[PDB]
Design a protein around this ligand. Structure first.
Ligand SMILES: N#Cc1cc(Cl)cc(CC(=O)Nc2cncc3ccccc23)c1
Ligand SMILES: [Cl-]
Lengths: 305, 300
């Protein structure tokens, strides 16, 4: 029993965090094999960031301009290239702590753990989801750039996010490990705003199944709905459209609890139109959308890494 | 910006998790130097849990009765002793991944990260607080016994909790790393119930200061209160009595935001009276009590 926002054990990722310094800027890097990956804006000054020409700023740099530190050991940079918004520093030493890894690009609604770092030193781990507006509601201070997001699948660390910036609303923007930003964001000091956010419907339903598994059933009702009628209601409440793929992915949870996906949709429909009425679900007065159906199954089954 | 329930990086603790097997029972152990620490109920069977005699059950065991598995390597047990409710298995190999550590006993209201494990394999990490009723609202399934709670401060891992049991309400009970249970609990199948839980007042106040640091002030009011009047109102909402020690600990946050501790207490009193009226504080519709004043200063 118990339901917590649980992150993957960060250990395999901690052994990859390094500190990258270019001039006066100090951020984090991810050391995998003989390459250190970090945001390309590490080469920018505050004046350069206003209108950066990264090929021009990078051509002016040499290997010894990049100070890389793995704990208390300085790594020597022997090459440097740029792939989209990520700077790839070739180093002379291969990271002996390199885990089995893959670079994956996640879709909005997908969750991941973030290992927040400052000066190549991990300070905390938390779980979060890629919002439908492509931002993450993270917890980041200055120096956190280069901190990464990941999932652990068996023994393989799938790196899915690298932190680059904070938007004026306090939400965060970053890229996959190939340097492609999530969302309509650019790495420059300019007017960028997150779009209007929506609630991840499939995740709220998954969390409602986790509440039923934990003995919270007050919200269940005798009613069912059609997938189209639910989506007309969901669109009204800024909820993401629930697709047939979402209904299929919720199948194991539906079979485990005996509550059909469209039966759970009618509970959500009533919660949206009437509220919780002073009640909580899993100790929460809001409908939680940062647990995917797989997170619910993994946490309510006991999968280890 | 942003405020999240953040756990400590679990890496230093992951390198200590081992699997301990005694007969048919399999739970987790914490391998530090040449000692593996695990709940003493690993030696218990079916007709044992009701009224076990651990000295009697342990005297019947030998070193080779304990199978310890660190990853895919079986560790050889060369000694075994009991310290309160923890079984201490002396092993022939010192853990090369042993971090700088200390065993600390925490007080209710204090927070820590839990590295949930099954079969000596870490599956997840989460943050939580020692409730005023000495239980933890964890997320634990069968086989999680021996999973530990910890804090990391200045490269040192302070081990503060070892999971022992789940109470009938779904909350969890465990011990410090010296085997002393938190609360009036025992490692027996006897009728054990958690006492009435209360909200950690000092933590709600700390979280209200974190909201002011992140730019939220909607809940503040022109009022102040006396410490005694606040406690008379707090008791009516099942809130822990706020002590002068709590008021002192909130001093740095009070000075940073410019909001006196008893002024923030007046906002809490009002928030308890009115609720949030459709608003949220740090993305939450409830008053959060699992962030200590120290966590707020650390994260903000
Ligand atoms: N009688 C008795 C007795 C006494 C002790 Cl000290 C421990 C246990 C096992 C026990 O409750 N551990 C488990 C730990 N955490 C979550 C659990 C969720 C389902 C099932 C078991 C869980 C039973
Ligand atoms: Cl009220």
């Amino acid at each position: 029993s118990g339901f917590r926002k649980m992150a993957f054990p960060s250990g395999k990722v901690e052994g990859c965090m390094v500190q990258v310094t270019c001039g006066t800027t100090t951020l984090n890097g991810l050391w995998l094999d003989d390459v250190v990956y970090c945001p390309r804006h590490v080469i920018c000054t505050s004046e350069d960031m206003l209108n950066p020409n990264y090929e021009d700023l990078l051509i002016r740099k040499s290997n010894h301009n990049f100070l890389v530190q793995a704990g208390n050991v300085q790594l020597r940079v022997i090459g440097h290239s740029m792939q989209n918004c990520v700077l790839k520093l070739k180093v002379d030493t291969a990271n002996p702590k390199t885990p089995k890894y893959k670079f994956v690009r996640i879709q909005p609604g997908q969750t991941f753990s973030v290992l927040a770092c400052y000066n190549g030193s991990p300070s905390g781990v938390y779980q979060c989801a890629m919002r439908p507006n492509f931002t993450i509601k993270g917890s980041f201070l200055n120096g956190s750039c280069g901190s990464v997001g990941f999932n652990i699948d068996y023994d393989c660390v799938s790196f899915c996010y690298m932190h680059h910036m904070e938007l004026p609303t306090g939400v965060h923007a970053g890229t996959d490990l190939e340097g492609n930003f999530y969302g309509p964001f650019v790495d420059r000091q300019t007017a960028q705003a997150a779009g209007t956010d929506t609630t991840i419907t499939v995740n709220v339903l998954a969390w409602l199944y986790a509440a039923v598994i934990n003995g919270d059933r007050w919200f269940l009702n005798r009613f069912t709905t059609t997938l189209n009628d639910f989506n007309l209601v969901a669109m009204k409440y800024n909820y993401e459209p629930l697709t047939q793929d979402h209904v299929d992915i919720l199948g194991p949870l539906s079979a485990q609890t005996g509550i059909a996906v469209l039966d759970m949709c009618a509970s959500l429909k009533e919660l949206l139109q009437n509220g919780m009425n002073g009640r909580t679900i899993l100790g929460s007065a809001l409908l939680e959308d940062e647990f995917t159906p797989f997170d619910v199954v993994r946490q309510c089954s006991g999968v280890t890494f």
